[PDB]
């Protein structure tokens, strides 16, 4: 019996809307578990997101299941989706990001 992916720290995900002062770090987390161990990837505005096009790139951590962006700027505004998948199943969550002048 393998197990579809599930969130391991739901309580940590509750702050869905993030209104961040320009210059601060935003950290988005989607801790999951499953068998086999799920993979995580991020979308921005529905598009695969690697941070090739943002100043400073991103930190990714499969270890922490997190997306980390330092020095947020206006063009960072958007919707960030974490897709957690394994052979068995699929789960997704959205964080909303705003950046304050």
């Amino acid at each position, epitope marked *: 019996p393998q197990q579809a992916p599930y*969130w391991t720290h739901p309580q940590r995900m*509750e*702050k869905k*809307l993030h*209104a961040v002062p320009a210059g601060n770090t935003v950290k988005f987390r989607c801790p999951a578990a499953g068998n086999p161990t799920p993979t995580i990837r991020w979308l921005k505005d*529905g598009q695969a997101f690697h941070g090739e096009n943002r100043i400073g790139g991103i930190r990714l951590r499969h270890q922490h299941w997190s997306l980390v962006m330092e020095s947020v700027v206006p063009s960072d505004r958007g919707t960030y989706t974490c897709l957690v998948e394994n052979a068995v199943g699929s*789960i997704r*969550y959205n964080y*909303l990001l*705003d950046v304050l002048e």
Partner: antibody
Framework: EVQLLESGGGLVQPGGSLRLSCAAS????????MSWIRQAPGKGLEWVST????????YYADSVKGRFTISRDNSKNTLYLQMNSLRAEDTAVYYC???????????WGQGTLVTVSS | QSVLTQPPSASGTPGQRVTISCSGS????????VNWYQQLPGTAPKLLIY???QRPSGVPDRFSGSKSGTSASLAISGLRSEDEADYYC?????????????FGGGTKLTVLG
């Protein structure tokens, strides 16, 4: 004291346009996500649209997508709902709502009634 | 109609316990926080429960929110006449279209006797 003051509702023909406004005070307006939620009389709540503090992100119910536009003027502390191609089924009381970091409403306007009828 | 499902009506006699249910899916209730609103006639909704189970200041212990899986529950114990109102559950929903807010269709609570 938080204050959300709707204006602009009224009677409109099918196909016509109408802009709702909502004037905010008692809080830093540009920090908050703001929503429009509507209720047809004697019917349930339905979410219409949300906008982010800066105005940079925009989200719409399927039934209004491509007819309504949410916007805001932060220097006037005002939220707007531009409504176009109005259909009868758009008749409702429209409410301004303030959102928290947790995605729920923590403050509502009094509502403005919009009637779409020939 | 609504993407969350509530029973249209609920009844109780004073001092009874009533529970209004709210059925959803994994993309809304399963993953996102549930909120409950109470609405009196000709007035704006009032927050009863946020982040699944928390009560705002001013909302008595008689109202308690819970959820399990894709189903949420508003339990009202010590039913009072002044509880008659419409009740709505609500949550964000992470669908394929992107995130949107979904409401239950509302439950009319009647206090009997």
């Amino acid at each position: 004291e938080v204050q959300l003051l709707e204006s602009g509702g009224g009677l409109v023909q099918p196909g016509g346009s109408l802009r709702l406004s909502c004037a905010a005070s008692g809080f830093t307006f540009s920090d908050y996500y703001m929503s429009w939620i509507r209720q047809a009389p004697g019917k349930g709540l339905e979410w219409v649209s949300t906008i982010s503090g800066s105005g940079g992100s925009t989200y719409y119910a399927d039934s209004v997508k491509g007819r309504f536009t949410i916007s805001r003027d932060n220097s006037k502390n005002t939220l707007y709902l531009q409504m176009n191609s109005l259909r009868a089924e758009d008749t409702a009381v429209y409410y301004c709502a303030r959102l928290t970091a947790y995605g729920h409403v923590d403050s509502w306007g009094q509502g403005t009634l919009v009637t779409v009828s020939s | 109609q609504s993407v969350l499902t509530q029973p249209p009506s609920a009844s109780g006699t004073p001092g009874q316990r009533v529970t209004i249910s709210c059925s959803g899916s994994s993309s809304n209730i399963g993953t996102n926080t549930v909120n409950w609103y109470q609405q009196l006639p000709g007035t704006a909704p009032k927050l009863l429960i946020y982040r699944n189970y928390q009560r705002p200041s001013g909302v008595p212990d008689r109202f308690s929110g819970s959820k399990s899986g894709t189903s949420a529950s508003l339990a009202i114990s010590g039913l009072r006449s002044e509880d008659e109102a419409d009740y709505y559950c609500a949550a964000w929903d992470d669908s394929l279209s992107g995130p949107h807010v979904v409401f239950g269709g509302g439950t009319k609570l009647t206090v009997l006797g």
